[model samples]
Each structure stands twice: as structure tokens, then as C-alpha cells.
Target: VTDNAGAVKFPQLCKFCDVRFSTCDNQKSCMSNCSITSICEKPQEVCVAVWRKNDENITLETVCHDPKLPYHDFILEDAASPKCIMKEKKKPGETFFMCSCSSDECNDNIIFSEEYNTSNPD
Candidate 1:
């Protein structure tokens, strides 16, 4: 197959971006609108996915980012990794998982690790 990548300006890998929403469970079903695709506006942009649980609601969000810029510092170091495991079982309102990948639509799926504690609060 003759693969010419110069044919389109949208050469950047498209990401399945979505906003956080209570209905967007971190499990099998995704409630947020993920049908839209985003071609990163800048070269440093990368796909990011997060899982947050607060009080009684859990939300999921996927988007693109520039790791060099100011953001959730927790992810800056590990954004390049494909795994979405939580670093520590922090309190609610904080994230339980964060992940980023460079591949096309790589943020489409995330598998939570057993290290995450979503059962009780202190």
C-alpha cells in the first residue's frame, strides 16, 4: 500500500475528546458525547483520560493537552504512559486515574487497576 501522509493537514492523530459528566461512568458505558474527534491544535498536544469520583458521583473525561503547560501535575510525568492506574488512593474530588497516549484515538478506552480504592471514604 502506497501510504502518503502528506495528503492531508489533519495528519495528527485524532482523539476521542469528551467533557466530564456524572452519567459518564468509568465502566463499560460512556455517557459523554465521544462521537466527535479532535485534531490537536498544537504539536505538543496528546490524548488524556481521567476518572474522578466525588461524594456519590463518578465522572469520566477525555481530551488533548500540552504536557509542558500547567495542568494536573500528577499526569505530567505519566501522561506518556498507556496505563491508567491511580498513583495513590487519594480522597475524593481528586482523580483516581489518569492516562495519556500518542496513538490515534488512544484515549478511547481505559482499564482501571485494582490499586484504586473506590469503595469507602475516610
Candidate 2:
């Protein structure tokens, strides 16, 4: 993250990933490349887990984000399936979940539901 002037300052180090969405098709691959690092822009910027699920396919992403964003408060309906739900906050959907924490690299250990898969799915 950066300030308005584009000055680089490390607020809090967070795990980062910039992989194709399909990289999450396998949990091993997802975790392999996502442990990279970056700095947050502000103290209020929290570690975040961004995930999407469609049918059996699920994609997981981690980053730094501001919880004060308007979209974070709104319940986001999935455009592809009514059964799927999403929000930028902690609300877990039938096929989706988004969560945040203030600790450094906190989003690195995401736990998927056992109902979704038998092994560590994140």
C-alpha cells in the first residue's frame, strides 16, 4: 500500500498473492505462492482474506484492505448463483467467506469448512 504522494512506508507487513484465480483450484498450489509479502498503506489497513466459490471451484486471495469501505458493509450477492453469497467482512456464505485481522500475515492461515473438503482446504 501507498500514501497519496506515493511515498513508500511500511505500516504492517502482510502476506500477498497475485496469482491467476485458478491457482486456488489446488490448495497446495494456493498456499505455495501466497506467502509472499508486502507492506500496508495505513495503520487501519487490515490483513484480509478474499475468497470466491462456484460449485466445487473455490478461489482464495489475501491482501490488505480497509474495513471502512462501503462495499464491506453491504451483503454482496453473487451474480452467477443465488445460492452463493459474499461480503467483504466476516460473513460466511454457503459458498464464500471473507475475513480480516489486524495482525501481520494473519490471513495466511485460512481454514475451510470440513463439510467443503476433508483436508486443509486453504
Candidate 3:
């Protein structure tokens, strides 16, 4: 057998959106253990959490996109770190809240409050 004997790395499986849009609550409906998953396609991929905000209405979605691929207007390299911080992509009428992380299912728990986004210096 190959020398696959380190920390026992597993596939990069992340939480799924479950539907076209879902709320932040309801773990079983929004994100299940194995039934719902976004399998990472790249060698070292990252999980993505997206929240579309229309004024005050929010719609959450999750994905594990490949690093070699393009993720909208964002440069995925900015979120290849250990944490996933929600950032906003402002529009005229709507705002796209986005976050990316390398850890498995890391997007399950995100700081989705508008306050955090406003009180940021970045």
C-alpha cells in the first residue's frame, strides 16, 4: 500500500444549499451530514457560503468550488485561509454576502449579521 499515513486526510466535502435558497437555521434541512454535500473538485479546494440580501431579506447557499475555477467577482485566493469571513459584494438593490474556507463544512456556522459587515475596517 502507499504510505498514506499522516493525519488521515479526507475528501473536501462541504455543506450543500439543500434548495434554491434556505435560511440560516434548520441544520437537518439546510445542511445534512452526508446526504447533502458539495464535493470539492480541486486538489486543495475551499468551501463557499453565500447569502443574498435584498434590503433585509436573506437567502443562504453553500458550495465547495474548485480553486482553479473562477468564483464570480471574488478572487478565491483571499479566502484560502483557516477562517471564513463574510464579505459583501454591493449592488444597487441587493448585496451578496460571501465567505470561503478550506475546512470541511466550515460554512455551517457563519457570522451573517449585517452589523459585523458594517463594523469592519477592511
Candidate 4:
């Protein structure tokens, strides 16, 4: 559904990326050149951010997710834990965080600050 501007409406496109673990630790470097635009296949599918950290090292992954699956809500809350549905752990000190949103490229500007880290400890 295009508006007067002829832009595609609903199921908006999002940013997707899988850069080096070191890249996610430096916000400036990661956002500079780490993602590609991905058009969501389902209207309910939205941009999702999955952030994983182990000690000082961090990794950020973003993509489109379909909400119809039972694990959708579970992933948002369990994806990052040691034994969860979307667990992506590599070490004992590792942890994760997940967020789902409906805006276009909403996950593109994720900021992995010290404050965000201190708040969610292993």
C-alpha cells in the first residue's frame, strides 16, 4: 500500500547484519558500515535486535522476525539466556538481550553502552 509518495506501506524494510564480534563493541564502527536493507516478508514480521556479550566482547545481530510463531514472544525474553530458545552463547561469561520493534530499520542504531551492560549481568 503506497501513499501519495509511492512508498511501500506495511511490512517495512529493516536492516540486517552479522558483523565481526569486535565490531559490535564499538558503536561508531558498527553503524558506519555493517548492515543491509531487508524487506520483511510478513506484516507482523518486525525488526529484531539480538545482542550477545561475553565479558568485554560483544556481538550484535539484527533481522526480520515473524510473529506468528509461538517462540516469538519467548525469544524476546529468552533468546539471550544460557539455555533458551535462541541461545547463542560461546562461553560461561556470555549473555544476550533481545528487542522487537515495528519501525523501519529500527535495529540499525543499537547502542551497546556500558550502562546497558552493567544493568544485565551474568
Best by TM-score: 3
Query: Of the candidates numbered 1 and 3, which has the greater TM-score value?
Result: 3
- 10-100: candidate 4 lDDT, tens digit per residue: 4667777744453555332134246677777776676666666666676677767664454423534332221213223333445655455
What TM-score does each of the candidates earn?
0.59, 0.53, 0.61, 0.55
Best by lDDT: 3
lDDT of 1 by residue, 63-83 (tens): 777766655544365555544
C-alpha lDDT values of all predictions: 0.56, 0.52, 0.58, 0.53
- Per-residue lDDT of 77 in model 1: 51
Off by over 4 Å in 3: 1-6, 18-20, 23-38, 55-57, 112-122
Order the candidate numbers by lDDT, best to worst: 3, 1, 4, 2
Model 2, runs deviating above 4 Å: 1-10, 19-33, 72-94, 111-122
Candidate 4 or 2, higher lDDT: 4
Candidate 2 structure quality by residue, lDDT tens digits, 1-122: 64232453447667677432544543321332455777777776666666666677667766666656634566323322211122333445544455556666555554333134556446
Worst 10 residues of 4 by lDDT: 78-87
Ranked by TM-score, top first = 3, 1, 4, 2
